[PDB]
Amino acid sequence: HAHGMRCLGIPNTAHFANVTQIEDAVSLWAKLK
Amino acid sequence: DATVYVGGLDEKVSEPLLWELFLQAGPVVNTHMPKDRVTGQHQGYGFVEFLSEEDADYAIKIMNMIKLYGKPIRVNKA
Amino acid sequence: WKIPPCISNWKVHINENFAKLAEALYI
Amino acid sequence: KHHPDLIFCRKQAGVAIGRLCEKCDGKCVICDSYVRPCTLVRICDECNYGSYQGRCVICGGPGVSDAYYCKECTIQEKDRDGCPKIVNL
Amino acid sequence: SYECKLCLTLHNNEGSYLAHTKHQTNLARRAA
Amino acid sequence: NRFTVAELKQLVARPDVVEMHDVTAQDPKLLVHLKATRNSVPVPRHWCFKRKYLQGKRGIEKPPFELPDFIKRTGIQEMREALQEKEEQKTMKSKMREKVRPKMGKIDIDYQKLHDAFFKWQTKPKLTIHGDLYYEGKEFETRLKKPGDLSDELRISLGMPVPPPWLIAMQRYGPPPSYPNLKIPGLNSPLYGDVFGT
Amino acid sequence: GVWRNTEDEILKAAVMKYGKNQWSRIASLLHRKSAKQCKARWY
RNA sequence: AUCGCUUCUCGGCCUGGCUAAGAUCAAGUGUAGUAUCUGUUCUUAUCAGUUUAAUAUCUGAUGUCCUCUCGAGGAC
Ligand SMILES: [Zn+2]
Ligand SMILES: [Zn+2]
Ligand SMILES: [Zn+2]
After folding, report:
1. Which one of A22, B47, D45, F61 is most buried, by most CB atoms within 10 A?
2. Nearest Cβ partner for B26 among F143, F157, F176
3. In angstroms, how far apart are the furthest CA atoms of chain B?
4. Chains contacting D (3 or more CB pairs within 8 Å)
C-alpha cells in the first residue's frame, strides 16, 4: 500500500493516509505551498 | 525481503537496542527475535522486519557496519 | 527389623437369625 | 453523603432564613463540609414561612441553628443557586 | 488482587481463584 | 446528506483531521472547523473500544510507588519497614499486650529535615502539556531515539565519541529509504551526547 | 447451614493440613461453622 | 587390569513427655451503586425496512420456465 502511494505520487503523509481512494493524489504536496 | 535478519551482536545489542539502531539508521516495523522456553533472552540475532524491502536493504548495507555490543553487526535479506 | 515410620491420626458380617426373626415377624 | 433524588426548590433565595437541626449540625448545606462556614442560607419561600417554621432545611429535625454555606462553596459562589430546603418528590 | 493468567481472570477473593480450576477450557485454548 | 472524505479534503484545509466517522455527524464542517485549531483535543477511544477505560490490563503486576527525592533523603521508609516487619513478627497476643502497655519512639528524627524536604528541597515535577490525553499506553512513546540519531549504548559499546562505526556507510547511503526526513549530523548533515541528529 | 464451594475447599484444605482429629482448629478458620457441622459435612 | 563381595568415603537420596482430645471458646444491619469469577453465549442465504458514529440490534423471502423419478437434462 506504500507502493500504492508511490504510484499515487503523494508522499506517505497523514493527509495521504486519510484518503483511501486514488483521487486523493490531486491534493498532494504539489498542490499547495 | 521485508525483514532484515540482523545479527553479529550480543545480548547487550538486543531486540530493543536493534530497534534503537533502527531509529538511528533504518527503521524496523517489527522484531522477530524469539527465544527458547528455558532461556527467554534476546540474543540480538533477529529478523528486524523493516519498513520496506528497501529499508531492509538499507539495514543490510548501511546499518550493517555497527560494532553492536562489541561485535560487528551484519544484517542480511530475509 | 525394618521399622516403618509411625504416622499419627492426631498430628462386617451380620447374623441371618436377624433375617429369620424378621421373616417370622412378617408372617 | 447526598442523594440523586430530592431536589430542593431550585428557586431564587429571598428573605426566609435557613435553619439547621442538631442531627446534621455544622455541615455545609451543599458539600456537607465543615471548613469556614461563611454565607447564611436563605430558603426562598414558605420553606420557612408557615408549617416548616424553625425546622431543618436538611433531613427534617427540629431546626435550631442558622444554616451556613461554607467558603469552599462560595469560592465557586454556590450560595446564589437558590433554596436548599428539601421538598420530597 | 488475584490474576489467573491461564484465563486472564480477575479475583477479588482467593476462593474465586480456587473455584477457578471455565478454567481448563481457556487453559487448553492458551495451550494451542 | 453528507460528503465523502475526498470532498471533505477539498473543502477543509486539514484533510488528516477529517475522521472516518466525523463526516457522519450533523455538522461535519463545524466539527472540522472546531478540530482545525491548535488548541483542540481528541475523544478518548473508549467510545470505539469494547474494552473499558483502564480496566482490561488483567494479567500484569506493577510496582506500587516510588517516593520523591526529598522524602527518600529524609528516609521514612527504612524505619517504617522495620516497624512493619517487627509488627509482622509480633504475635497478636503481643499486639494487644503492646496496646495495653505502649512504648516510646515511633520515628522521632527531627522537624526541620521534613520542613526543608517540603520547602527547601522541593523539586517541581515534569508536568505535561495542556493537550495530553492519557490512555492504556501514553507513558511509553518517548522516542520522539531521534531519527538519524544513535543511542548512548550505541555510542558506548561501539566506541563512538561525542564517530559511529556506521557513519561512513550512513553518509554513503545518504538519506535512508526508511526515514527520508531523518537528519544524521556529522556524516550527512554537517549532535550532542546520544542524540547525534534530528 | 448452607455450604459454599469456597467453604468446601477451605474445609478440604484444612483437613489435608490439620489431619482429621483437629476440628476446633478447622472451625476457627470456617466462619459461622461449628466443629460438629464441619465433621458432618466432611464425613 | 577385569568382575564379585565386604566395609569406609564424600555429594543430591526417608527421618520431639504425660494428664480429663490437659481444658475452654467463636453472634449482626438497612441505602443504593459497582466489580469479579461463575450461568448462558456467537456461521445457511442475500436483500431492503428499522437501528446505530458505525457495527450489533433489527421485520420479511432465502436461482428460474418445463420434462424425467430433495436428483438429473434442454432452446435458456
Ligand atoms: Zn460547602
Ligand atoms: Zn437535619
Ligand atoms: Zn425553597
Report:
1. B47
2. F176
3. 36
4. none
Distance C2 CA to H1 C1' (A): 40
Contacting residues for F156 by C-beta, under 8 A, at least 6 apart: none
Look at the alpha carbons of G19, G24, G28, G31 in this order and tell me if their dihedral is positive or negative: positive
- Strand H footprint at Cβ < 7 Å? C 5, 10-11; E 4, 7, 9-12, 16, 19-20, 22-23; F 21, 24-25, 47-48, 55, 58; G 21, 23-24, 27-28, 31-32, 34-35
Q: Resolution of this PDB entry, in A?
A: 5.9
E strands within chain C?
A: none
Contacts F61 to E, Cβ<8 Å: 3
Inter-residue contact G26 to G38 (CB < 8 Å) = yes
Asked whether the beta carbons of A15 and F9 are under 8 A apart, the reply is yes
What's the distance, Cα to Cα, between the start and end of chain D in Å? 18
Alpha-carbon distance of B40 to F139, in angstroms, equals 25
Residue F116 to residues A25, F70, F73, F125, Cα–Cα distance (Å): 62, 8, 11, 17
Contact flag A18-F6 (C-beta cutoff 8 Å): no
Q: How far apart are CA B75 and CA B59, in angstroms?
A: 6
Touching check for A23 and chain F: CB below 8 Å?
A: yes
F16–A21 CB contact, under 8 Å: no
Nearest to A30 by CA among A22, A16, A18: A16
Query: Cell match 497476643: residue?
Result: F93
**Domain ranges across chain D:** 7-87
Contact indicator for E21, G12 with CB cutoff of 8 Å: no
Report the distance from CA of residue F140 to the C1' of nucleotide H40 in Å, as an integer.
Answer: 39
Cα dihedral D51, D56, D61, D66 sign: negative
Number of domains in chain G: 1
